[PDB]
From a paper:
The intracellular bacterial pathogen [name] modulates host cell functions by secreting multiple effectors with diverse biochemical activities. In particular, effectors of the SidE family interfere with host protein ubiquitination in a process that involves production of phosphoribosyl ubiquitin (PR-Ub). Here, we show that effector [name] converts PR-Ub into ADP-ribosylated ubiquitin, which is further processed to ADP-ribose and functional ubiquitin by the (ADP-ribosyl)hydrolase MavL, thus maintaining ubiquitin homeostasis in infected cells. The activity of [name] requires a motif consisting of Ser, His and Glu (SHxxxE) present in a large family of toxins from diverse bacterial pathogens.
In the LnaB19-371-Actin complex, Actin mainly docks onto the carboxyl helix α14 of LnaB19-371 with an interface area of 1763.9 Å2. The structure of [name] contains fourteen helixes and a long loop that folds into two subdomains: The N-terminal domain (NTD) and the catalytic domain (CD). Two regions of LnaB19-441 are in direct contact with Actin via extensive polar and hydrophobic interactions: a long loop consisting of a pair of antiparallel β-sheet proximal to the S-HxxxE motif and the carboxyl end helix α18, which we designated as Interface1 and Interface2, respectively. In interface 2, H359 engages in hydrogen-bonding interaction with T148 and E167 of Actin; E370 and Q363 form hydrogen bonds with R147 of Actin.
Author numbering:
A (entry chain H): 20 to 55, 59 to 370
B (entry chain A): 2 to 35, 67 to 95, 98 to 130, 132 to 231, 247 to 363, 367 to 375
C (entry chain B): 2 to 37, 50 to 198, 211 to 230, 238 to 375
D (entry chain J): 22 to 55, 59 to 154, 158 to 370
The structure:
């Protein structure tokens, strides 16, 4: 009966690890199903999930719920209304976001895979080799596939703190990373963006047993990023090596501002960096995005008139839905997690 | 209307256990031979014959159309050996399903949802770590050594003490002895020096020592003692305390008296000198998987963790189930 | 609604045929073996023959041990039919010439031990004719332990003509052993056929295999095997054959009824499932009889479970309601009601 | 409500005679009603007398007067089947049952009495006409009967005068045809087929087949059809009277002769019935003749013809007979139609 899918959320909305994110994801399903013209709302709230504006959208959702309380029920609005005021997020336990983002990257890749001319990356080489020649890349005359484009683009770690330092200093934000200097180690795991190794994955979303790092959040750095931006899934820092993409790119912007397609070609790169870095576990959308979105690093784009779409796809639906499903189950099986941690306590 | 019952089936390598939900008793336990076994080292290999175990299960032993069905699966089952479980029941058997990990079911029986469980059956002995009631892929470890093999061992050992149990009926005699008389010894070596169906034998502590050391058999694998530790150290340092303090013996081949005290010792010495080691053995370990499932099928909330026939309208097995 | 449904159990020498009323099939057929959980009944025991001493409760069609026969019933009702009998009315089948005790032993059992709501015992050979739809005739039941030729008239048998032979299926198989091992080579009984003239056939004196052992040619022993029924001499029994047992039987009757009998000869049992017994019983009976009479030999194909079919067709009768024994009757007249009601 | 219809299912019998109506109808009443002891005892007395036509009246009239305490199915269905009931001395099987049960019940009454010394005296009255070859004094009944069953030695030649006194002995129906031997269950109930309780079945014995020559005018089976068999007009009873008159002549003013002679006659009557030779109604009818009454009038002796006061027991077992006899006929019918509704 359907009233077991409704109770299920009445019961999934009562877990002690529910946060701001999971609410938006479960509610929509709840609205999408309690109802069955309201197409825009699941896109308006969606756009906001990719931007981490869970704050306003929770409320708009709970404004639609009341306005359309007619086609919904007293119970859904009651419950939904009780849970919202009491909401916070923890990077460590914000894991639905992580699935979304892990799945989003693979989505931004086909896109880039559908973006044919990969010559854009090849030309970028001539700019790296002039930034750190001592560490010059000397590879395929042509980067033909994104896997080739990706590995090299991930090779900017060769550009040391030395050629990037002029840039890292002026940021006010970078001095505020909160990655502790305690080398906690490596832990083996089943999915990369969802670094949590004990996360309930779907067997479909399972990758090989790769060894992921454990990173700690130094809560005491005054101004920790995690403190200022808690929605961002796991962040102990801000993307340092992004400062390096910029060197290779500052030299490129100025050499190919002459070309008229640079607007496209710069987003092809920035988007790829954003995707591969989220898939491979190195960072989070926002860790990378907040750096390039800096007063000093945006000037370069302004001078040559480039408008960046920092990897923002407006068809993020499949990813949304897939996550709505995550929480659904995660929440039920972790609420009985204590039904049998209470029935058992009735044997002793 | 009545609350129609759900059904719980642990399709096993050697024996199948069906019964009815809630019941403290599985109704039926029956050899799976169709003579050809479908399930292999824990993973179904011939599906067609297993469709048959199912007909027997649903119909001849238990006497599907109006009863929901919860087949049990294994850790790290090839997942396409999952969708198919979904497909046969919904389609061939038009069931009004949820597939679960046997291990998860055992811990659940324990009354807890986090620990590491050792499950020795006949096909495979698995050490699975479960946290938050979730099977952990990066740590599941297995051994293709288990009870069926141990029976064979008792054969050879007696084969040379002079008794001979060659025939098929005779093979059952051997199984009968392993099942009871033979035991796990706390100090093997002392006990193979106190050395120096009931036709008596001193190969009582050696048969289950094969679980601890598979060398007798000629297998290059570590004792269940270590498949456990090993698996543990592939778990976050943080959760280890618990896993150590929540280790449950289960499966039928763990019915050998005394595996407990030993599991404690061997692991204890291998363990951090400071952690907390606790082994929990239920006397009902023979059938602990099932009982585990009954509880659940009777849990009010699990009722929505199932799969609707319209929800079926086979890749929902990954996304609505675990 | 849902007037409760009956259960019919043919307790035979070799197997137990159980089912429910108003059905066209036995739901569960299993060996009558109790091997000794505190006991193992049924095919399961057949699997653990090793450490268990199998015993057969029903011998030669009649119940010798009631201690294990009660277990072919817990098993039947409870674990092969999975029904509690308290709820469902239970017919039982009985063998010809059943002593009085067994008819009073049953009643005690299922109304006390099993607390059934209704009981009924019937000669297994009557029910067999009930399948043929006849009420008067001669039924040659041939089980695995006992073959009889019981005359039935207007619904009743004539105890004076009930004739018995201790020759059966178990026996033919056993006899065949001698001969198969006599060719220097479980069994392929599904290739044996009864010849019209054994002597001609032996004057003509097909391919069977399993992976182990070898492909084997079924020898001339095929017709010799069921020829044991006709000439039990092969088994060195001077007891008369099935052709004769039948004729002799017919003549222990009033000469008014016989014509009917010669024309209503039903063959029952799996030992009669051999192909060709049909033409043989005939050729042979015609010889021993008034050429004028009609000899009709009737062998239906549901014969193996004929006993059952008739029984279902009997408990699945509205007019059977009155015949059954209500528990109070037992609670009143004791087990003796068996005779007063199950005639 | 299950019991009423059954008797309504028994009242469709093609073969129900008169003796069968009474038994079931009273049984219908014994339950419907449940102060009426005077009716049921008076039905037994008439039933013993074979005076059923008077009984039927009483049964049809007892329903009108007490129709308020019954159902309307009872009250119609009797007056629908009563006028079409004809007796048949061949197929009267329930009747035979009743009297075989009384033959065992009347000899026990004489087994309850201790003086079997009347019999010894008779031998001395036997030896005057033609010991009885016996040297064990008459002590038990199994020798008193045997010596009285020996009166068959007084053959036609020594009883013939009394045969020429009767006007009814010429009118006898036994056919001169030698039909042979039937291995019966019981002897009063000679037939091969009768359901018989394990209460009333006995060792297999061979009993003659009797044929009525119905050509005779005024023959016994014709005049009085209630009496079964071919009605046993007993000619061997005439030889009894030879001894009885002679016993009255030698031992005469015996204070206890009327007691002593009823012992001889009843036991004679109950020995001849139990053993199948003849039927009650005919042993009695020979003796009812006026020249045979006279002899007992010459000494002032009144003949207690085997009549007992407490025959409820025997009455009920005939209800259980006809009930099962009738109902099984009904299922039998059903099968016939349904199977003929299969072809």
């Amino acid at each position: 009966s359907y009233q077991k899918i409704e109770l299920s959320i009445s019961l999934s909305l009562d877990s002690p690890k529910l946060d701001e994110s999971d609410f938006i994801l479960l509610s929509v399903k709840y609205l999408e199903k309690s109802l069955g013209e309201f197409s825009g709302f699941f896109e308006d709230i969606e756009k906001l999930y990719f931007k981490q504006n869970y704050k306003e959208a929770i409320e708009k959702i709970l404004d639609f719920c009341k306005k359309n309380e007619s086609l919904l029920s007293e119970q859904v609005v009651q419950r939904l209304a009780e849970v919202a005021p009491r909401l916070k997020s923890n990077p460590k336990d914000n894991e639905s976001r992580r699935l979304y983002e892990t799945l989003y990257a693979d989505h931004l890749e086909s896109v880039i895979k559908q973006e044919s001319d990969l010559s854009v990356f090849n030309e970028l080489r001539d700019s790296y080799n002039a930034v750190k020649p001592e560490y010059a890349v000397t590879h395929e005359t042509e980067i033909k596939t994104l896997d080739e484009a990706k590995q090299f683009i991930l090779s900017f770690v060769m550009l040391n703190d030395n050629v990037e330092l002029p840039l890292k200093a002026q940021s006010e934000r970078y001095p505020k990373k909160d990655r502790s200097r305690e080398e906690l180690g490596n832990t083996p795991s089943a999915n990369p963006g969802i670094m949590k190794p004990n996360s309930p994955n779907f067997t479909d979303n399972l990758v090989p047993v790769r060894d992921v790092p454990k990173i700690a959040i130094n809560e005491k750095v005054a101004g920790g990023y995690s403190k200022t931006k808690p929605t961002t899934p796991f962040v102990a820092s801000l993307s340092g090596t992004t400062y390096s993409l910029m060197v290779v790119l500052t030299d490129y912007i100025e050499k190919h501002k002459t070309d008229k397609d640079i607007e496209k070609k710069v987003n092809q790169i920035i988007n790829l960096w954003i995707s591969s870095y989220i898939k491979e576990g190195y960072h989070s959308y926002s860790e990378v995005v907040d750096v390039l979105t800096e007063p000093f690093l945006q000037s370069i784009f302004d001078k040559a008139n480039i408008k960046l779409n920092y990897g923002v796809l407006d068809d993020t639906h499949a990813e949304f839905r897939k996550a709505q499903d995550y929480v659904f189950g995660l929440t039920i099986q972790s609420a009985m997690h204590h039904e049998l941690q209470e029935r058992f306590k009735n044997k002793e | 209307e009545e609350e129609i019952a759900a059904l719980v089936i642990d399709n096993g390598s050697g024996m199948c256990k069906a019964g009815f939900a809630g019941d403290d008793a599985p109704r039926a336990v029956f050899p799976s031979i169709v003579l050809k076994y479908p399930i292999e080292h824990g993973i179904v290999t011939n599906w067609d014959d297993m469709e048959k175990i199912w007909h027997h299960t649903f119909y001849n032993e238990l006497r599907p159309e109006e009863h929901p069905v919860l087949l049990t699966e294994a850790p790290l089952n090839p997942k396409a050996n999952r969708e198919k479980m979904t497909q046969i029941m919904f389609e061939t058997f038009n069931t009004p399903m949820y597939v679960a990990i046997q291990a998860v079911l055992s811990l659940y029986a324990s009354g807890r949802t986090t620990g590491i469980v050792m499950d020795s059956g006949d096909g495979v002995t698995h050490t699975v770590p479960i946290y938050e009631g979730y099977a952990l892929p990066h740590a599941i470890l297995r051994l293709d050594l288990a009870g069926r093999d141990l029976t064979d061992y008792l054969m050879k050992i007696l084969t040379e003490r002079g008794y001979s149990f060659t025939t098929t009926a005779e093979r059952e005699i051997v199984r009968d002895i392993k099942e009871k008389l033979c035991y796990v010894a706390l100090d093997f070596e002392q006990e193979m020096a106190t050395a120096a169906v009931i036709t008596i034998g001193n190969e009582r502590f050696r048969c289950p020592e094969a679980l601890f050391q598979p060398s007798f058999l000629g297998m290059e694998s570590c004792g269940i003692h270590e498949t456990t530790f090993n698996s543990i150290m592939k778990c976050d340092v943080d959760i280890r305390k618990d896993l150590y303090a929540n280790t449950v013996l289960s499966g039928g081949t763990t019915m050998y008296p005394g595996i407990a005290d030993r599991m404690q010792k061997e692991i204890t010495a291998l363990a951090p000198s400071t952690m907390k080691i606790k082994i929990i053995a239920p006397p009902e370990r023979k059938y602990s998987v099932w009982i585990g499932g009954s509880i659940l099928a009777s849990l009010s909330t699990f009722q929505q963790m199932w799969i609707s026939k319209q929800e079926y309208d086979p890749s929902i097995v990954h996304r609505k189930c675990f």
